[PDB]
Every structure is written in C-alpha cells, then in structure tokens.
Amino acid sequence: MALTAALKAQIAAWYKALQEQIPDFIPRAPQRQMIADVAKTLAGEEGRHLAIEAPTGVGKTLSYLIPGIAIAREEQKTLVVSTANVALQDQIYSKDLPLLKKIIPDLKFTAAFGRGRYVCPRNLTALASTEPTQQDLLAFLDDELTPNNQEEQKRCAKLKGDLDTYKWDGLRDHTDIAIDDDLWRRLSTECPFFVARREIQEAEVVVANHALVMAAMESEAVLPDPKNLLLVLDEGHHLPDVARDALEMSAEITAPWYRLQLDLFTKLVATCMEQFRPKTIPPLAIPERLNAHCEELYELIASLNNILNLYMPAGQEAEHRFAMGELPDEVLEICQRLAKLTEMLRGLAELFLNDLSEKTDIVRLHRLILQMNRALGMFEAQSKLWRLASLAQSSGAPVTKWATREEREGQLHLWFHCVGIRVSDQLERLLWRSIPHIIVTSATLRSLNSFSRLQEMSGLKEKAGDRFVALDSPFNHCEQGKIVIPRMRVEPSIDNEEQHIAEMAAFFREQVESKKHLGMLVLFASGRAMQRFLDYVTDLRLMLLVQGDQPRYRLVELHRKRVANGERSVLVGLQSFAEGLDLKGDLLSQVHIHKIAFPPIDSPVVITEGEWLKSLNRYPFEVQSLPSASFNLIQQVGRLIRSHGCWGEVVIYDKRLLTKNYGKRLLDALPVFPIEQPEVPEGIVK
Amino acid sequence: ALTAALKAQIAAWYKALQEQIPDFIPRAPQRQMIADVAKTLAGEEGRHLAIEAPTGVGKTLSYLIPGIAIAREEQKTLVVSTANVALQDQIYSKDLPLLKKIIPDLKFTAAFGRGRYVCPRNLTALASTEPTQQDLLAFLDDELTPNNQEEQKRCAKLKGDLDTYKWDGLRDHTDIAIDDDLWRRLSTCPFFVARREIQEAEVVVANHALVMAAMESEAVLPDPKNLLLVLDEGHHLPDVARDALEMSAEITAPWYRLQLDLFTKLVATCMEQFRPKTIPPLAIPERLNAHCEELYELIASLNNILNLYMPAGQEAEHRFAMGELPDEVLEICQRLAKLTEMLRGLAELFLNDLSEKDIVRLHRLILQMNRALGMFEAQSKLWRLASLAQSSGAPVTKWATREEREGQLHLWFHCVGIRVSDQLERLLWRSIPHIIVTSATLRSLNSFSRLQEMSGLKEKAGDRFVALDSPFNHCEQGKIVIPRMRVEPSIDNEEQHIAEMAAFFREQVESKKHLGMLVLFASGRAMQRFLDYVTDLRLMLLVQGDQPRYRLVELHRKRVANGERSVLVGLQSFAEGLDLKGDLLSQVHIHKIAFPPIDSPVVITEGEWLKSLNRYPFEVQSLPSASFNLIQQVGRLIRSHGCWGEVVIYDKRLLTKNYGKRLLDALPVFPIEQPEVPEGIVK
DNA sequence: TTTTTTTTTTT
DNA sequence: TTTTTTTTTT
Ligand SMILES: Nc1ncnc2c1ncn2[C@@H]1O[C@H](COP(=O)(O)OP(=O)(O)O)[C@@H](O)[C@H]1O
Ligand SMILES: Nc1ncnc2c1ncn2[C@@H]1O[C@H](COP(=O)(O)OP(=O)(O)O)[C@@H](O)[C@H]1O
Ligand code: SF4
Ligand code: SF4
Ligand code: BEF
Ligand code: BEF
Ligand SMILES: [Mg+2]
Ligand SMILES: [Mg+2]
Fold this sequence. Notes:
DNA-binding; 18 strands; seven-stranded parallel sheet; 48% helix; binds adenosine-5'-diphosphate; binds iron/sulfur cluster; binds magnesium ion; globular; alpha/beta; binds beryllium trifluoride ion; homodimer
C-alpha cells in the first residue's frame, strides 16, 4: 500500500536528474502533482484506477513514465504505455523514452504494433524480382505477387535491401520509402513481426496503441499477464470509441458458403476421431448427433438469409439497419438458437484442437491442427456475433444490428453485424477489473467541467475506488500566444467546401509570404479537404511535409531538421498531427486549423445511438457531436504552447466560432488567448 | 510531529505514574524507550522501531504512555498486540487499569479470535435440553444435546453467569472447566460486543495471530492507516506470520468432482433465475463445463502422482525436499492456479451480482455462492504458492497429507513459505504508518541481523534498531542454581530426570524460604509427568490446564499477598511476559533448555535449505530460539530493584555441552551455585 | 429549444 | 558444531 522509501527516493532522484537533462528545465507544479498521484495509484496506495486530466503541454509523458518505470522495476512488472495512434507511439519511443534513457541508461523499452503493419518477407521477395512477369493464363492462376511496374519493383528492392541493411524494422511507418495502400496490402499477408513481438517479454516499457491493447486483452496472447501489468492509457479519452470499434462483430452468413463450412467441419471432426481418437468421445462428435446439429444450424441460417434478403434489393450491394437495435421477433428467435448452436460447435472445435495439440504422426497432425484452428476461429466469430445479436441491451444501451450484401470476386456475400453502443461493462471485464491499477490520462477528459461523460462512457466509477483529478495549466497562454480568427466570408458548410478552402488557402499563402514563422502546422478534419487544399499551394510543395507522402513521424523528424536549419517547413496532416504531437518553440509557431471537426454521423452505430439518445429525450448533437468537436479543438489549439518559451498563434478558419450558438462554448473550453480577427484576401476557387 | 503539547502530556502522565507506583525507582532505559516510541509513532524518526529492552525494565508503560497520548491527540486506535491470551489478560487487568486512574476517561478493550467466544445459541441448547436417550430420530437430527446431565448443569451455570454479566463469554475468562470437545460445541452475542468495543476503543489489546488475520481478512481492525501498532514480545512475529501464511486445500478427487458439479449447477441456476445483465464468458455452460473438466482431470492426475509417494491406502504424508516439486507436478500446479483463480473470480462476480440484487430463494443461492467463493479462494491461494520456486528469498515448503475423518480418506495439499519477510512487508510494514516491535530478545549474536532477515524490517526502509540496557543489579540480586543432576535431559532419560527434578524441587519447597515459585516446562508431557511426583503438594500448586492461565496468576497473587506459599506451574504462556515483583516470585524452576522441535515439514525443509547454503541448522533454527527462551524464562525472576531469589535450571547441559557457555553468556551475569540432588525415585 | 458529416487501429 | 513439540488464528 504505502509507497516505499526506496521508491519515493528513486522517483525524486530521476525527476531531479531531469533538471540537468532538459537544460531549459522549468519547474511545473502540475507535473509534480501528476507524478505523485500516478505513483499512488500504480503502487496500490489509494484506490483502483486514476483518471487524471492535465492540460496540453503540462508534460504528462514524463509525469507517468518516471513513476511507472520506478514501480515497474521495483515490482518486476511491465509498464504498458498506450496512446491513440502510431505517430504518438513513435514520438514516445523516439523522443521521450530516449531522453529518459539518458537518465536510466539500462532502461529496456520496446514498441508493439499489430501484425498488419509488418511487411511479410515472402511477399517482399516476390514483389522485388528483377524478371517479374508474363501475362500467362498460368500466371493468372498462379497469381503470386508481381511488381506492377518497374519503379514499384525498385521500391521493393530498396525496402528489401534496407531490411537486410537493417535500416528498416518491418513496420509500414518506420521507413522513408513511401508505400501504397494497395502495395502495403500485398506486402503484408523469424519474420519481423515475431522479432518485434519477442522484445515485449524482456522490455520494462512497452509502447502500444489502444486498438492493440483491446485486442491484447481479448486475445490474451500479445502482452504479459494482466496481473503483471502496469498500464497507462495516454490520450485516454479515445478508449470508449476504440473499445466500441474493437468489440464490433461481423460474420458472413451466406447460406451455401455456410453449408460448405458445416460439411467440412463434420468431415474434419470425423477424421480427427478416426486418426487421433480421444479417450472420451464428445457426444456432439457422434456423426448422427453432429449432423443433426449442423442441419438445424444450417436451416436457421437459410431462413435468416431469406428474411434478410427480403430487406435488400435482389442482386445488388445493399444494407439494412434495424432501428433502435430491435429485431423482429422471428429474427431474434433465430439469433438466440444460432448463439446456442454455434457456441456448441465452437466448444467442440476447441476441444479437438486442445486434444490434437497436446498430442505433439507429426506432419499429418500439424495439418489437422491448422484446419481445426481455422474452424475454431470461424465458430468463435459466429458465437460472439449471435450472442451479441440476441442481447436487447448491453451496458444500458441497445446493440446496433445490421446486415450487408457486399461483393467479392463477382459474388455477393451476406454479412451480419453487431455493435454494442455502450461498452462500459466490457471495459470492466477486459481492463478495469483485470489490471490492478491503470492510469487514464489526457488533456481533454472532462466534458462541461465534469467527469460525468467519461464515467458514463468508460464505466470508471468512484464506488469501485477510481479517482478523478483535474490539474491546472502552468503556462500563461495570453503572455505567449494569440488565437486569430480571420473574417472569412463563408462558414465551412457542405455547400461551401470549395469556396472556404480557397479563402483558407489565400490567407495561408500570405502567412507564408509574411516570413514570420519558420515552423507551422496545417490541420484538416478530412483527407479530402486536405488533398483539396494542396491543389492551391502546389507552387509551395517543396516546403510542405504532407501526411501520406512519408510515414507520419518521419515527416515530423524532417520538419524538426529543417526548422533547425532556419528553413521554412510546414507540416500538413490530420488527426495524427492534431493531438499529442510535441514541437517546442520555433519548431511550431503557427498552427492553422481548417475547421471545427464535427464527427461524421452516417454510421449505423452512430445513428442507432442517435435514435436511442432521442428515445431517452437527450439531444444527439449535445451528446455525441459537440463534445467531440470541443475535445478536438482543445487538442489542436494545444499544439502551440509546449513550454514557457513557446510562442506564436493559432489560426482557426471556422467563422462559426463567432457565428453559431456553440462557438462561445467552444472558445470557453480553450485556454485563455487574446483573439484577433484580420481580414482575408479574395479566394479564387479553381 | 512531537509537538510541545504532546511532549508535555506524555511527560505529565509519566509524572503522575510516579505517585501511582510508590515503589518507583528511576529507570533510565524506560525513559529512553518512551522518547523513542513517541518519536517513531509520531512519524518524527523513520518508519518503524525495533527496540530491545531487557526483562523487567518496564516496557508495557514505556510504549503504553506515548501510544495513548499520540492516539488520543490524533484520532487513531492504539493496537497493542502480544504473544498470547495470558499476556493479553495481563495488560488488560493490570497495566491498563493502572494508568486508567491517571486517565479516568481512557477506553480500552481486548480483541480475540472468534473461536474463543461462546455461541449463545449453542449454550442455550446445551443447558436447556436433556441428554437424549439413544434414539435414531435424535441421532438423525444431531441437535446439540449434552452427553450427560452433569454437562447440562454446567452449561446452565455458564449461561447463568453469562446472562448475569458475570462471564464475558470468552473461554479464558470463566473458572468453570471446559474440555476441548465441549468448547468445540459451545462455540460457532459476546463476540460482536467485543468487536463493537474495538470500534471506539483508544487501546485494543490483541495477539499476533489476530493481527495477522486482521491484515489478510480486513475486518477485525480499523483502517490500517488510522492505527498505532505495538508488537510486544515481537520476536514471535515471523513464526506467527509463517504459521498464518500456510495455505492448505483439499484435493480429494471424488470430493473435487462433487464440488465442481455443484458449482456448475449453481452457476446455471443463477443464470436461469437471476440472470446478471452482463454474462461473463466463463459462465457460458459449454465453457464452464470445459473449464471444470480440465480442472478435474488435473486434480485426478495430481491425486495419482501424490498417491505414488504415500503409504498405500492409509493416513500418510509426503514432503518434497527443498520445496522443489517434480516438473510434472509443477506444471499441474501452475495450471491449477490459473483454473482455480478464474473460478474464484467467477464466484466472486456472481456473489456481487446476486448480492446487489425474491428473498428466500435468492438468499439461499447467495449463501451457496459465498461458500463456493470460499472454496475457490482457498484453492487459488494454495496453487499460487505451489507454483512459486521461491518466496522472500527462500524455498516454499510443499507437502501432501492423507487424513481420515468419518471412515474416508481426504487428500490435502499444503504450502508455506519458509521466509515471509516480503509478505510481512506487504501486509504489515507497508500497511501501518508506524509500528513498534519490542521485546527483551530481539538480537541474537549481539546483532539485529537475525531479526532483520526474519522480519523484513530494514534500515533502507527507514526502520530504526535500538538496544537498551538493564538497570537492575542481577549479580547483587539473584543466583543461578544449577543442581548437579545425575542424568542429562535427553530422551531415553526423561523419566529419570523428571524424578530427580521433583526430588530437588520438593526439598526447595520444604525449606520454606520462598513464598512465590514458578515452575516452567518445555512440554505438557514433561509437566504432567512431573506432577505425578508432587501430588501431595497439590493444594499449593496452581497448574496450567486446571483454570484459565491468568486466573491462575490472580489466585497466585492473592495467596502470596496473604502470606500463603504458592507455586505456579505452566508452560510457554508463563515463561515470557508474566510479571510477579518481589514476594510474588522469588524462585523460578526451569525444567530444560527449550530447544524447538525439529519435526515440521517446514522446519526440515528449512534445515536442508540452510544446509545447501552451507549453514549449520543448529546454529540458525535451534540454538537462537533456545537462547531467547532461556533469557525470557530467567527474566521472570528480577522485575525490580529489591527483587531477589534464584532461578534453578535443571538442565546440566549448560555445563556439560559446548553450547552451554553461549547460553550462559547470553544471560545477565549471575553467580552460579551447583548444589547436590537427592536420589531420584522413579514412580 | 438547440444541431452535425468521414480519423485511426486491430482482429 | 547438535536439537525434539507452545500458541493462535482464517
Ligand atoms: N519541467 C519541464 N521543463 C521543461 N520542459 C519539459 C518539462 N517537462 C516536460 N517538458 C517537455 O515539454 C514538453 C511537454 O510536452 P508533453 O509531455 O508532450 O505534454 P503533454 O502533457 O501534452 O503530453 C515536451 O517536449 C517535454 O519533453
Ligand atoms: N519505574 C519503575 N519502577 C519500578 N517498577 C516499575 C517501573 N515501571 C514499571 N514498573 C513495574 O515493573 C513491572 C515490570 O514491567 P513490565 O512492563 O512487566 O516489564 P517488561 O519490560 O519485561 O514488559 C511492572 O509491574 C511495572 O508496572
Ligand atoms: S510468417 Fe507472416 S511474415 Fe513471415 S513469411 Fe509467413 S507470412 Fe510473411
Ligand atoms: S454468535 Fe453469531 S451465531 Fe452464535 S448466536 Fe450470537 S449471533 Fe447467532
Ligand atoms: F496533452 Be499533450 F498536448 F499531449
Ligand atoms: F521483557 Be519483560 F519480561 F516483558
Ligand atoms: Mg501527450
Ligand atoms: Mg513485557
């Protein structure tokens, strides 16, 4: 419970070694506060988890890293630091942690990423063949990867050498060679993914992202045991959303495909029995029983195909969302029985998998193990899906339910989808009650000056011993920067995107001509808006580092290097650069914000949530839209001031901050800045 | 900190005490210990304080005065814990009353385990129900029925003294004899009255076992953060700790199959009738059944493996050397730890859900779930320890026992860490802000390293280690009398040696030079045997086992005060904290050097681990505790300036053997006389 | 009452 | 080096 004397001493010595390690170190009261509270929670002195809000630039990273590393070493535990995206992962791994390793020269830290971001060596080799192709029928059936053209081949040769000259580690984000979305789909499914994941076991600090932490809690195969984990959820305000996205379930239900899956599974169970018989035979493994079971399950799937197909236009890609997540009684009945039958088949598959796997006819057995694993995976998905479709509520809210008919290989496949609108109870099972003590931190945790929204979405509760701390900002923003809202003619509506982007490009272009700022950042709410904006500043492309051209944090580095040379450099990007990115002083003195980032509203889950909110007589704009845009605006504005020596301005090109009823509330959530309103040149939409 | 108001207050109380003790003689180490205990308890000087003061210095008042002052200034409960119930009673009926005069608003209570309280229901049944004559209907019911009428009458006078408020309900606080069988039936409302008194008492007088339990089952004491804790006779703490931290759980395969079947059916019935609005994955029937099957198969395998180590179909035992399990058994234990921990969590979750939630049926399910939780708590802790290779830098003792109860055999698995320093660190040292550990025997070979290694108290943590001096003039105040026993106190000579000791003792009584005597034995066997030679002296003997211990002490004091000779005879409980100044005790008879029994699986495994660390087990486990024991025993005699008399030690190995020097050198310097012994007539 | 539109990650 | 069974609790 109580912090040891060795531990407090160790934290104090490291934190003091910081004064000599940041030569321009200035004491920060909230940093000290957050060190103490983080130490208390992680060491098990006062409560379960800590949701601690500390404003942008306070220095939260070192605030949780220092105590976390101390307690990890003393307790022989693993500190897991999770952030919102790979760019912020890279920043912790490449900038914060190395600075801390100057103070702790034996610190061992790694970063963890999902398998999909790692290049596959077989695909890379095939993609980097000098003599690539024939347009053979043989080639068409043998469609192992071909280098589309010669320059792309050259890319793959470069990446292939740089893998073997060890510049590249295997991750899409960790090379300077730009790679295409489709080319990455080709490149990525001993190998870099396993040599990367091996380092987790011996690392004291693992830098992950929230998606990977969610998958890790449910898989239970990527991180160490939860009881041996110290977990910090940096930029924690994204956890519910990520959790909701992690717990979405989708499975194919196309009846002929489903019947074939059941046929194969029957055949596979029987062959396991005849070749590697278990000691006790599962009742469900008896052939008459097993295909009685499979026949009932198939007929249920066929009827659900008929029913769902009556909703959608025959023979076209389509979708149908059930309002309020309420299924018709017949469909719910079917779902409940499918949950039963697919769970039973899942359990049978798991049983055979364990039996075969314990047996470790080695090659024959390995083939059967892989097959049984694939069947097990399929029934796992099924079971989760139908158990979710059968719920009338989950965490006090409906479950979004919808079906799609989508195309692959010229064939339509029927898919069914379920998403819990609220997810708190699942967070309780996967994180809150599984990890002894967790830090949830961010500069934007409170909504309307309350932890109420967060408590509703995450499930964290005072009654369970969760603490909620709101810290102050040490910087005097009015003495360091200014918010500038140009008097644009057009609000950034939907009818005005071209006009507004052209007027923004014009003003921006004079700010570049002003030569007042070597370091600037341009932030957009959508890729389309950004790509559209780049059409107006083409003559400037040499000075721009744009998200998409090189991996995000490699762009950040290039920016740091140019600004250090007295060169004008402009970062252009999206959400990844709008949050957590740390550019001190001259590295970022002018931030351009394209818009208020109101979230998109077209998803089945978001509109089902909207109808549920309205059924509870709550306004969806107030609940699901305005806080998202407020939080985003606070983070974006927060890119500017990172120190008492930071300086400059935040241009916000959304006149609605003064124009609409919600503009006052948005500005009130921000740090206090003087506001200037300069005039705008003519915007020539092209 | 130690404010001026608090210094003055402690000062003033210690001032009034001089008038309440008119035999007062100034005691320097007493003053020192008072200042150190106040400093530590107020937080001024580190974390915890291990302070050794010699026997009789007056430690009780030394820690009581600062503790009460500081506890009162703030809003803390001073928990005074000592080694046994007899010492609890001595603090409660003697010392605390003595400074309650000075502080007439002082509130103090004693806390004991639930086992020491009578269940008023059971007492009522036994007193108000005639013995049944042999009738199956009576047998089938197995209602509490007194074996005979004598027993019924005695339960009736126990109930009369209870309801007349003449008996507090504690086994130790009535003079009516109660054998272990009858107390087993009388006990499970006095217990809740005692706990309520804990809630607003300024001083709570406990024992070490109850503190340990309070630290793991967090319900007997208040929030640790609001506690001041003194551990009187603290040299017992590691042992208590070790004994409390032993985990055992049944693993009988048929029994285990039964328990898993019941838990499965119980979970399903909860699901069907009080479904929690969130289903835990493990509660899905296909998964809970797969889980329980795997668990059962592991338990059956473990049963087979262990049955290979133990004598065939009988009461048996098997201990794993060095606490190292065969690799297959380690694998099984690790998997059992996971599986039982998961089932424990599921039972807890369901208990929480039912509990937060059709009163009669649901109450029934809640009690069933709480028992299931209990069973899986025991299992998961046991396997978690069985899985460890080391705890607190030492092996984990691991062994299985097969015992018979009602015509069937039960298989049990037991684990106990040999060192518990880290567990004491997590449960005590890091849980209470400031703790006094005090005793007359804290150092061993004139160093605090033994206590440091056993307890986990360390300087690094800001724990202080103080050794005070004795004011008393032992050489000018008493003698060590070692008679020339013909036979050593070995094993095939015990009858002979007890007959000689009885003869010498009998002449010491016939001399009439001592009004107060204490006879101390190392075993109940030896004491009972020696009593066979003094039956004619029975009327002046007060013997442990005949009345509760401290009530024997009180009778002893009354008789001695009225000029009648009195002889206390007892064991460990009379050997340590007992205080009899002056006339109450001028002759102490020590039967033996109390070397500890070397019989425990834990003690054997410790012996071989010491050996593998190239340490002589005699030097670490037997001799130091014999020295502490002898020092404490000898320390019963001299309690003051003007105390007088002698300590007869009937173990001639203090002169014959080579550890004799070291035992004698560790005592206060006493002249040693070696008188002749009468012939020993073996009865 | 109010109002709003597409980022990021992993399975 | 040599030792041998008290006490208390969940
Ligand atoms: N006491 C301090 N003095 C000076 N710079 C600091 C101090 N603490 C942190 N920093 C640096 O100031 C910036 C703080 O930013 P960061 O930790 O990214 O803030 P946030 O809390 O938004 O994550 C970083 O560059 C960090 O290295
Ligand atoms: N200053 C003193 N002078 C004389 N007797 C004292 C003094 N202080 C305490 N005593 C008494 O001496 C006896 C021994 O004290 P006690 O606390 O039993 O010693 P120990 O330190 O071994 O526990 C008690 O009766 C106590 O009240
Ligand atoms: S293992 Fe994953 S990465 Fe290595 S080759 Fe097979 S697929 Fe490509
Ligand atoms: S003690 Fe507890 S159980 Fe025994 S009677 Fe009083 S209340 Fe009922
Ligand atoms: F809150 Be900081 F800008 F990451
Ligand atoms: F040290 Be005293 F005998 F309690
Ligand atoms: Mg940050
Ligand atoms: Mg004492």
